[PDB]
Amino acid sequence: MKKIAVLTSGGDSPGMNAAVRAVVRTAIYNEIEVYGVYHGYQGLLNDDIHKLELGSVGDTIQRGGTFLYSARCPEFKEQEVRKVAIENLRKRGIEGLVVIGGDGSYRGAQRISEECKEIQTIGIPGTIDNDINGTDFTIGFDTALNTIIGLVDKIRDTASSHARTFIIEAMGRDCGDLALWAGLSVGAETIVVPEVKTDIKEIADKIEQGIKRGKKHSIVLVAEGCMTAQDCQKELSQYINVDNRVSVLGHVQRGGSPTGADRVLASRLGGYAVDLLMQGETAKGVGIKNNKIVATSFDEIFDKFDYSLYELANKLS
Amino acid sequence: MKKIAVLTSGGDSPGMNAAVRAVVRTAIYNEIEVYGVYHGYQGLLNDDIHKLELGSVGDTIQRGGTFLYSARCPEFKEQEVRKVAIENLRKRGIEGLVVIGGDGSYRGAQRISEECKEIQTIGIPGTIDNDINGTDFTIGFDTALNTIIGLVDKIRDTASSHARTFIIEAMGRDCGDLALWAGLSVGAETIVVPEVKTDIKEIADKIEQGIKRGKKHSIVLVAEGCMTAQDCQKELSQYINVDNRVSVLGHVQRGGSPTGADRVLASRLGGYAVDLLMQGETAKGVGIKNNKIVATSFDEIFDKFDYSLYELANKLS
């Protein structure tokens, strides 16, 4: 395991830079040469592959985004396209590949390991959505959670001033974790998530049962995986007429400097990925599970919602 | 379990308000009357005990500190003094007591349970220092970690401008967790903690072996449990003369709005404490361990440093 490559694929997330840093430093510490692949799988294809020295990851651990960049490469689904990428790594004598990203990125890495005997692949879970198996938490989630919190905490100031109900849309793709953890953390009176049957008539009645008791407004936190905030506002108005506004938090959720949890998680997983390559492993995604650093086969991973937590937020509301 | 009291004792920490909120709301949801004890054990003694309604914990989940206040009461070590506090709770028919704080606060709660048959006690771990058994993480730790990170990230800006080494003192009492997690998260070149033998000559030589290689300054993160930053600076200057400044981060570490991790942890533990009282439990401290909510006897608790993590930060440096 003398040469390894590292790349970032799928939606960027805070902490990806830390992960890349840990991969680069852990490799160099073990006398392993390391190449940055730029623009995710697209760079694999376009041969945008460049050696990285210690200094290439200076001033990165605190920075949001990915300095390696990420771009979609749907053509990577074609085995013949992969042959070009595979050759581009074998040209340089690369024996291992660390892929930082999500489910799609992992499938890329599985294919690389299946289709080239001389390359081992290890996946590192990078997404704000928390929607990746093999880990309780993905790199980005803690940062995005906090970002949502800070935004809604500011929305609550204006909601209180005007007794104004806000219907807020969170990211998450098909996962409700962001909406749930954030809704709890801001005392949201309703949390709408794809994992729980969504009862618009019931949410209406709950709000109305709140006005009578003297609560003049609420926060509805809506995971985009369930419906848009504007659709939630539309459907609610059938049952009830409250003075309300829609906020869509948007891409702000993907940015910012990573939190301590993300920097530590990224660093651990970045280091572990290199160690796994050194040990001859392949076709696994790393993660933290019940507070232990683990590695799971992409199979198992491809083959988590906390109903208890959801119930707690509802009882506290 | 018809009446419960809740109090905050020891050094305040971000998330204590969330914990109190969860205790109050979970109690009221279960038709349990709840009394706030103010100024920790001192209020138990001075009879500063007042019923809390749903609204008493409105606008609290995002706020730092403890709205119940905390004050030291060393006299609580005297069994005869405790008799007064015990009577003050029995006067009102209180059958359970939730104590939010640290090791000292727990010992208070153990004594209450030992010395009054009709009162059950449950401890909730609130401290930024992370130094409480029965839990991987205490309420406050994540927030304090992030606070340290944000401060040092700003110090790095000025350190870089001037090629100036900073020797930074973190809180933690006798625990190095804050220093370790934060040192990792900021790429600190040296982390000084009480759990690891401290080699001032070795730290010197490491910095000097850095100047020759072209690194012009560093960050030394010093847990106060090991030594003061000023003592570190003193002892270093024996072996080396670098252009440097001392920062002591101080009480800023105890404040601020809690992070998502702290709000969720506090809420879970606050809710669980009430459930445990309802189930007839006593003389336990709650916590999260390997990502499960658990309860441990004060015995076991009174009877955690991650050497692996410390080694990783050193390899990444």
Ligand SMILES: Nc1ncnc2c1ncn2[C@@H]1O[C@H](COP(=O)(O)OP(=O)(O)NP(=O)(O)O)[C@@H](O)[C@H]1O
């Ligand atoms: N089934 C597949 N087989 C081979 N390559 C794939 C496959 N799915 C995805 N990829 C590659 O992985 C890249 C990233 O996948 P994509 O779905 O964009 O993001 P992801 O890693 O799941 N993270 P997210 O942004 O959260 O969806 C795609 O552009 C493809 O290059």
Ligand SMILES: Nc1ncnc2c1ncn2[C@@H]1O[C@H](COP(=O)(O)OP(=O)(O)NP(=O)(O)O)[C@@H](O)[C@H]1O
């Ligand atoms: N051994 C003991 N027996 C009875 N009561 C105690 C005991 N130790 C402490 N207490 C009570 O607990 C209070 C708080 O303890 P203290 O040492 O201030 O903080 P702590 O809860 O350990 N958290 P920290 O601020 O991190 O040290 C003290 O003022 C006493 O009222």
Ligand SMILES: O=P(O)(O)OC[C@H]1O[C@](O)(CO)[C@@H](O)[C@@H]1O
């Ligand atoms: O960045 P794009 O292409 O707009 O995609 C939006 C999606 O990406 C994510 O931000 C991260 O996967 C999701 O939460 C969201 O649904």
Ligand SMILES: O=P(O)(O)OC[C@H]1O[C@](O)(CO)[C@@H](O)[C@@H]1O
């Ligand atoms: O708040 P005081 O009394 O100055 O005590 C300082 C101590 O309290 C803590 O802030 C919390 O226990 C420690 O980290 C620190 O050593």
Ligand SMILES: [Mg+2]
């Ligand atoms: Mg995808």
Ligand SMILES: [Mg+2]
């Ligand atoms: Mg103490």
